[PDB]
Amino acid sequence: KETQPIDRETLLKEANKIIREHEDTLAGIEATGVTQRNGVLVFTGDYFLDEQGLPTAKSTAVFNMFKHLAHVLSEKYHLV
Amino acid sequence: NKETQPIDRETLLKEANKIIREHEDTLAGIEATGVTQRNGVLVFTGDYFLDEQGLPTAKSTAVFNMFKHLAHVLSEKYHLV
Ligand SMILES: [Cl-]
Ligand code: NA
């Protein structure tokens, strides 16, 4: 529950490492399925899960992007 | 009855994938160059690619998404000192 202290310079360095990671992963991200579960779009695709089926560092970018798609596209479209 | 536009799965997926490719392209240009902590939440700042009048553009959306993701994940790990 407790967090670690960090300074501005070190935090920005790690933040920028995350951005570069996301940029890398995004080249492989593709929505391959969508349903509308109750007025909410849910996009599906390859989450880059590990061999045991668990999310990886790489998966985080997929969850973020698919949530963004649901959030934005659900406001303008309904699936027929 | 509704206020969204109807769309089929094929067209919807094409549109979602274009958004993904667009975010991919913009991310090449994204860098967090500032951070503060406000009411316990980290706030990252940098170039939002605002238009000449200071308003968000389509390109800006990728930055807002990425910086929110950073605030959400890093605030749970760290606090700024
Ligand atoms: Cl309809
Ligand atoms: Na925190």
Inside any domain, residue B21: yes
Question: What one-character-per-residue DSSP string does A1-31 give?
Answer: ---EEE-HHHHHHHHHHHHHHHHHHHTT--E
Residue A39 placed within a domain: yes
| Way it was determined | X-ray
Q: Can you name the residues that pair with B37 across neighbouring β-strands?
A: B42
Q: How far apart are CA B34 and CA B46, in angstroms?
A: 6
- Tokens representing residue A62 in the block: 């997929």
Total structural domains in chain A? Answer: 1
How big is the CA angle at A61 (ends A60 and A62), to the nearest 5 degrees? 90
Nearest to A79 by CA among B4, B18, B20, B3: B4
Domain membership flag for residue A31 = yes
Give me the total of CB pairs closer than 8 Å, taking one residue from chain A and one from chain B: 114
Chain B: closest CA distance from residue A34 (Å): 7
Its domain, for residue A51, covers 7-75
Q: What tokens does A13 get?
A: 């360095």
Q: Judge whether B41 and B75 are in contact, CB under 8 Å.
A: yes
Contacts with A19 from chain B: Cβ below 8 Å: 27, 30-32, 66, 70
**Domain presence at residue B14:** yes
* CATH code of the domain containing B70: 3.30.300.360
Distance CA A64, CA B68 (A): 10
Say how far apart CA A69 and CA A73 lie, in whole Å.
6
| Residue B52, in any domain of the structure | yes
Name the token pair of A40: 């909410």
